[PDB]
Amino acid sequence: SWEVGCGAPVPLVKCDENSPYRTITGDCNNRRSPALGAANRALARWLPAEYEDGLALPFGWTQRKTRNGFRVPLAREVSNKIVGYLDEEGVLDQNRSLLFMQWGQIVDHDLDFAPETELGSNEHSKTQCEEYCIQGDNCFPIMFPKNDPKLKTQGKCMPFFRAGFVCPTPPYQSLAREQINAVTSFLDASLVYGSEPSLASRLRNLSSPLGLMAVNQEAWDHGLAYLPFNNKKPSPCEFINTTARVPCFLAGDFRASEQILLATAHTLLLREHNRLARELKKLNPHWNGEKLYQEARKILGAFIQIITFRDYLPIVLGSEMQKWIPPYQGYNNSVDPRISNVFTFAFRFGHMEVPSTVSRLDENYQPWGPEAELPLHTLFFNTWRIIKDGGIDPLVRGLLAKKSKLMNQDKMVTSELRNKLFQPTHKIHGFDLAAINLQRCRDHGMPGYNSWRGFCGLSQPKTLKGLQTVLKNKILAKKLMDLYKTPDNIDIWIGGNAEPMVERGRVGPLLACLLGRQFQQIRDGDRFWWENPGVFTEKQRDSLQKVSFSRLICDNTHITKVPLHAFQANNYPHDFVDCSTVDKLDLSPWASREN
Numbered sequence: 001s002w003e004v005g006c007g008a009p010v011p012l013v014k015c016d017e018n019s020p021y022r023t024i025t026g027d028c029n030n031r032r033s034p035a036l037g038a039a040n041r042a043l044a045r046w047l048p049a050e051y052e053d054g055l056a057l058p059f060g061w062t063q064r065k066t067r068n069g070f071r072v073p074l075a076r077e078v079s080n081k082i083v084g085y086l087d088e089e090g091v092l093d094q095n096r097s098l099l100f101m102q103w104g105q106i107v108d109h110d111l112d113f114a115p116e117t118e119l120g121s122n123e124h125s126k127t128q129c130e131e132y133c134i135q136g137d138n139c140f141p142i143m144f145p146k147n148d149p150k151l152k153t154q155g156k157c158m159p160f161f162r163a164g165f166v167c168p169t170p171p172y173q174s175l176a177r178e179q180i181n182a183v184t185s186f187l188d189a190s191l192v193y194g195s196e197p198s199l200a201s202r203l204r205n206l207s208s209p210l211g212l213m214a215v216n217q218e219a220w221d222h223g224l225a226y227l228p229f230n231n232k233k234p235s236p237c238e239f240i241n242t243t244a245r246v247p248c249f250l251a252g253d254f255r256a257s258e259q260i261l262l263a264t265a266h267t268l269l270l271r272e273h274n275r276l277a278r279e280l281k282k283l284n285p286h287w288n289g290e291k292l293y294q295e296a297r298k299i300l301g302a303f304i305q306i307i308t309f310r311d312y313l314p315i316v317l318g319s320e321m322q323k324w325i326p327p328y329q330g331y332n333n334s335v336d337p338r339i340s341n342v343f344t345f346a347f348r349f350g351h352m353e354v355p356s357t358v359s360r361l362d363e364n365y366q367p368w369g370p371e372a373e374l375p376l377h378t379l380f381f382n383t384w385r386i387i388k389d390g391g392i393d394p395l396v397r398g399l400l401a402k403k404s405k406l407m408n409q410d411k412m413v414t415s416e417l418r419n420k421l422f423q424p425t426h427k428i429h430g431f432d433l434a435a436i437n438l439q440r441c442r443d444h445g446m447p448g449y450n451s452w453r454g455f456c457g458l459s460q461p462k463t464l465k466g467l468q469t470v471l472k473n474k475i476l477a478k479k480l481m482d483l484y485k486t487p488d489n490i491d492i493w494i495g496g497n498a499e500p501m502v503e504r505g506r507v508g509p510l511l512a513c514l515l516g517r518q519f520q521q522i523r524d525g526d527r528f529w530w531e532n533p534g535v536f537t538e539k540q541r542d543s544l545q546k547v548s549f550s551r552l553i554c555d556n557t558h559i560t561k562v563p564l565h566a567f568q569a570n571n572y573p574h575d576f577v578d579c580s581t582v583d584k585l586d587l588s589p590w591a592s593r594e595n
């Protein structure tokens with residue numbers, strides 16, 4: 001029976017089973033099935049994988065082979081015709097701060113990561129893909145359609161490498177290709193701590209018995225910590241400004257430096273871990289480093305769980321929140337905690353919530369110097385603008401005082417992401433996230449729009465008129481039909497995001513159902529869910545109920561004025577209160593007296 005079992009390293013351990021702490025890897029959470037939700041395993045399949053050849057070849061591989069008797073449109077064609085827009089005026093979400101966008105990416109990165117196949121480490125395979133646009137093996141290039149401006153300027157294609165599967169060879173006992181989740185399916189702050197023991201240890205301060213995470217020794221933010229530098233070379237962050245030569249940050253997550261506001265959030269969380277560890281050292285001076293690390297790690301985890309379920313999901317799911325995530329009825333070990341392949345595409349709704357600029361604000365929330373507002377694309381893999389240009393406080397103020405972009409059927413993804421994306425492997429602000437998203441859908445063997453509509457119990461539009469009624473939009477339906485010919489072939493990422501938003505929410509019905517069910521499962525199937533009896537004391541839970549992102553900022557920056565509800569659109573000064581008004585995390589319930 002050939003077992004194409006290769007993917008990546010699965011550390012292997014015997015489960016403690018009576019540890020009050022999560023493993024780094026996510027192993028041992030489910031006692032009956034200790035690998036369930038652990039990193040470096042196949043994403044769960046809610047529907048069977050759909051491949052050109054039933055095994056591995058994505059739809060669009062063989063220019064000839066159809067999907068239900070239709071050619072699939074070029075990913076860049078779909079992007080150009082549907083996803084692009086010119087006018088950034090009027091596009092901002094009037095009731096979501098920029099923090100709404102940024103928290104989404106944080107939650108996402110905690111939950112799932114499907115890394116591109118390596119093998120191209122000091123490689124000519126890279127060259128044959130980038131330089132020659134040659135399809136084969138893991139090179140699945142994004143070809144430019146006719147009349148594409150990038151044809152005139154960049155070449156024939158954007159290079160694209162297929163997601164890591166149960167790893168580099170394609171021959172088995174005949175099974176469909178399954179993409180790997182490199183991070184823990186649990187909402188467990190894995191993007192801070194790592195999902196791999198070796199990295200998790202390297203991130204820690206083992207020089208002192210104080211359970212701290214390692215902090216940068218070369219640079220400080222007016223006394224406050226930065227992440228360490230990643231000193232792996234070559235550095236994409238060094239490359240975007242070779243004068244400054246400021247490398248990417250080293251974090252529990254490989255993607256931490258992808259853009260400056262994600263770098264910022266990673267900084268906030270690390271600071272909070274050290275603050276937590278110092279407070280617990282005061283309360284319990286007998287606690288050793290391991291105990292301090294795990295107990296701070298455990299609080300920070302529940303903090304992420306609480307902000308996500310109390311503050312974030314309701315303003316994503318709106319009317320559908322209670323349908324998919326009713327009140328918690330305790331841990332259910334029969335619930336699958338693993339993130340689904342399809343969820344990794346559903347949650348990419350965030351790409352339509354990213355605006356075209358980022359602002360640095362001063363202490364009166366006014367523009368910070370002459371270059372306050374920057375084009376998004378200049379901030380991809382940009383750490384020098386933090387280290388060499390004001391630290392994180394100006395960007396945090398921007399997160400509070402500026403707005404997420406609203407998803408718009410006529411204005412889906414900003415050109416900053418749709419034309420000017422920088423990839424860490426490559427040299428150009430020339431990539432298309434929307435085209436990459438659609439290519440990746442096919443790479444991952446995604447069933448089509450109507451397959452998922454069916455999965456979610458929703459009508460399956462079969463005609464122009466049907467799609468016009470689902471989408472409440474005649475031109476979008478038409479452009480969609482001209483490209484895809486049947487709604488059956490519409491790739492899940494554009495399909496789900498095309499649908500108008502549910503009442504009081506920021507996604508359509510299909511996405512709500514998909515995200516709703518996934519978030520129900522990561523709660524109910526998590527043995528270390530913060531509300532699971534025995535994980536915290538009743539009193540520790542009473543303390544935890546009072547956490548807010550506003551407090552996190554108050555406690556880990558020199559910002560003294562914050563809004564009470566950090567996710568809604570807030571203007572300074574009317575919506576901003578002094579930090580002394582904000583509920584604190586009372587840690588007195590973590591005091592441990594042997595007497």
Ligand code: HEM
Pocket residue numbers: 101102103104105108109112113114258259343344345347348349350351353354376380433436437440
């Ligand atoms: C400036 C902001 C952002 C940038 C530059 C960015 C960039 C990227 C890139 C390059 C990928 C990998 C695409 C692939 O190769 O398949 C990706 C994936 C993804 N993004 Fe985003 N993204 C941003 C914001 C967001 C937000 C706000 C969310 C959710 C609310 C989000 C959710 C995801 C998800 C779920 C994936 C797939 C898994 C992963 O994150 O690696 N992204 N993003």
Ligand SMILES: *[C@@H]1O[C@H](CO)[C@@H](O[C@@H]2O[C@H](CO)[C@@H](O)[C@H](O)[C@H]2NC(C)=O)[C@H](O)[C@H]1NC(C)=O
Pocket residue numbers: 205207208210212213214215216217
């Ligand atoms: C590990 O923890 C130690 C001790 O808390 C850190 O050393 C202190 O760092 C601060 C700021 O650099 C200094 O003011 C203290 O004087 C240092 N104390 C000692 C004992 O040297 C140390 O930098 C931490 N290491 C890392 C890599 O974060």
Ligand SMILES: *[C@@H]1O[C@H](CO)[C@@H](O[C@@H]2O[C@H](CO)[C@@H](O)[C@H](O)[C@H]2NC(C)=O)[C@H](O)[C@H]1NC(C)=O
Pocket residue numbers: 332333334335
């Ligand atoms: C825990 O989760 C399991 C799996 O979702 C649930 O199992 C279902 O229970 C009902 C009750 O009769 C059956 O009709 C289903 O067929 C069961 N299995 C399924 C759907 O997988 C169960 O409801 C949950 N158990 C508790 C105690 O809440």
Ligand SMILES: *[C@@H]1O[C@H](CO)[C@@H](O)[C@H](O)[C@H]1NC(C)=O
Pocket residue numbers: 094095315568569
């Ligand atoms: C903004 O959203 C919140 C819920 O997220 C809601 O309570 C409030 O009424 C809204 N404010 C507006 C529409 O400005």
Ligand SMILES: *[C@@H]1O[C@H](CO)[C@@H](O)[C@H](O)[C@H]1NC(C)=O
Pocket residue numbers: 240241243244245384388
């Ligand atoms: C690079 O950083 C320096 C300061 O290090 C700054 O003066 C310069 O404008 C930056 N260059 C680019 C290309 O962003």
Ligand SMILES: [Ca+2]
Pocket residue numbers: 110111183184185186187188189190191
């Ligand atoms: Ca995780």
Ligand SMILES: [K+]
Pocket residue numbers: 044045046047340341342343
């Ligand atoms: K799936």
Ligand SMILES: [K+]
Pocket residue numbers: 105108109255
């Ligand atoms: K990402």
Ligand SMILES: [Zn+2]
Pocket residue numbers: 221222558
């Ligand atoms: Zn300061």
